[PDB]
């Protein structure tokens, strides 16, 4: 299927110069011509850099783009507040004969100290255990810009099957919040030594872990 | 200062067929083809038609197009709860030599199956316990509508400590979750018999109950 990989979330602070990488593989960025469009929602998408490098009109100097390996960068180089958008990359594939997207990146002007946020990693409540049923979550609590990347594991292992975790929510204190949960069967949860919970928020990373415990 | 018009919503209900409007001009839709995405605001779009009315890979014979001049007009028969999504449309406009775009089209699958929320709540982690620190974290999943209110109460009186919920977000059963985390001490916590969350969803109320228990 294919589609540009592109990171959550790009920030800085007004006057800051942000990058946003968007890494196609060595079919796509890896050879054809890179395009790059700004999302507003209410608003049709704009282009921005026309192929790879040479800019639309309309477009400003501050918004580069350099496309290089199998990988290309714009980068909003002057962050003036309006620039708090989507930036998609298109580029050609051959998994037919098409044009593979970015999953988009936001772009947030740092309004508050960036920050990076409190997992807390909880297992199974003994109620649920005894109910045939075995839940974890993953508190994602005060982070800043709002985009949070979740991802569990079982001894080492990265599990797919039923996680689910929730959008980004701003918080009172005006971070978001967000929480993830990994449904098991109660054996499946007793079944490994521990699991883990990884939230990457804006280049850092955390990796929180829980284990089963005597008693149930 | 170019653009492609489309309605900014178009609703209905499961099996009703729907249609977006993208009208334009000459030198857009009416002298070339008309192309339309799939935009799971938050994903990379998926191209869903070209040469108007011309299909795609893996897309329903659920979505057809048409043109007519300066007229496109997606149609989506029979809306499933998953086609919510926004919809723009492209058509290369041959006096701006360059491709435009619609402003987006948010569907919204309106008549959904009641489901009630399921309720699982954890007492805080020793993990956490040993910082002293405490949260609870209140989980309401598959519900639908999207839409609730959590009290949370000690023992007694309900609580406005470090309530914090997230906004419910559909999820992959196309359903809702949402979190309703309670900052505490070691104290407030085993300071009180018990602490339960109340989640209303559409007239039915569950509260579930957690105390200061050992080992889970």
Not at 192 to 213: L, N
């Amino acid at each position: 299927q294919s589609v540009l990989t592109q990171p959550p979330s790009a920030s800085g602070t007004p006057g800051q110069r942000v990058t946003i990488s968007c890494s196609g593989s060595s079919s796509n960025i890896g050879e054809n011509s890179v395009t790059w469009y700004q999302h507003l929602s209410g608003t049709a998408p704009k282009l921005l850099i026309y192929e790879d490098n040479s800019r639309a009109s309309g477009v400003s100097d501050r918004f580069s783009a350099s496309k290089s390996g199998t990988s290309a960068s714009l980068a909003i180089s002057g962050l003036q507040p309006e620039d708090e958008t989507d930036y998609y990359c298109a580029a050609w594939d051959d998994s037919l004969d098409v044009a593979v997207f970015g999953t988009g990146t936001k772009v947030t002007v740092l309004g508050q100290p960036k920050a990076n946020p409190t997992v807390t990693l909880f297992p199974p409540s003994s109620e649920e255990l005894q109910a045939n049923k075995a839940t974890l979550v993953c508190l994602i609590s005060d982070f800043y810009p709002g985009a949070v990347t979740v991802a569990w594991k079982a001894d080492g292992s990265p599990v797919k099957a039923g996680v689910e975790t929730t959008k980004p929510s701003k918080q009172s204190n005006n971070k978001y919040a967000a929480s993830s949960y990994l449904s098991l069967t109660p054996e499946q949860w007793k079944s490994h030594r521990s699991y883990s919970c990884q939230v990457t928020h804006e280049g850092s990373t955390v990796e929180k872990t829980v284990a089963p415990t005597e008693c149930s």
